[PDB]
Amino acid sequence: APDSVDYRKKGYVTPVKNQGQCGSCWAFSSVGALEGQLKKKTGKLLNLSPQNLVDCVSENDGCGGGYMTNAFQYVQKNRGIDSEDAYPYVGQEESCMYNPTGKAAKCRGYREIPEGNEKALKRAVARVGPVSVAIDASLTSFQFYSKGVYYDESCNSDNLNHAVLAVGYGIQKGNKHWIIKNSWGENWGNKGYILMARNKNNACGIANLASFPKM
């Protein structure tokens, strides 16, 4: 495992999306992970459907939140997830309307990173690619992030309330970080991205609910 890795520079990461006024972070985290595996497997980079997940993952709560593991299971069981174009994002939950002709990827299971183990998350990112992670994104400091390696004393490892994508890791001006793709649009943070403190006692719970899909 290298000391720094950025899957964006390998072409594994799609443009930053905007979940709008719906608690579908978990769907965007899940599709980001699937996108990265799809590129690694097939050589194609393309947008998969978070709406497909929002409407059809019965184990999750749609715009009221959900888990990525339940998303990956849905895709496996369903034997497919649609492309964005085949099931576009509307930011509100509707009846499940999966379209077999628009299938753009499959899932053959998922694996979880041992809870709170940032070394294991690092190795997982280096060996697989982008990994779905859950964090405490509830602080005002998080909302108005612009630059630097995000750390706040008041972040809560036990309050996982937001889901994002770990697309890499490294170090900036002495400070180790995770490279995190968010889903609040390109005009949030640093072009839709945030660097979050790494190996600082599992800050914001970043390694407490990490998972990736198999393909």
Ligand SMILES: CCCc1cc(-c2cc(C(=O)N(C)C)cc(C(F)(F)F)c2)nc(C=N)n1
């Ligand atoms: C008003 C915020 C609603 C909301 C909730 C969640 C959310 C809720 C839960 C959780 O506790 N359960 C039970 C699924 C868990 C998670 C995570 F990432 F840890 F798996 C996220 N995500 C978003 C993302 N936008 N929005």
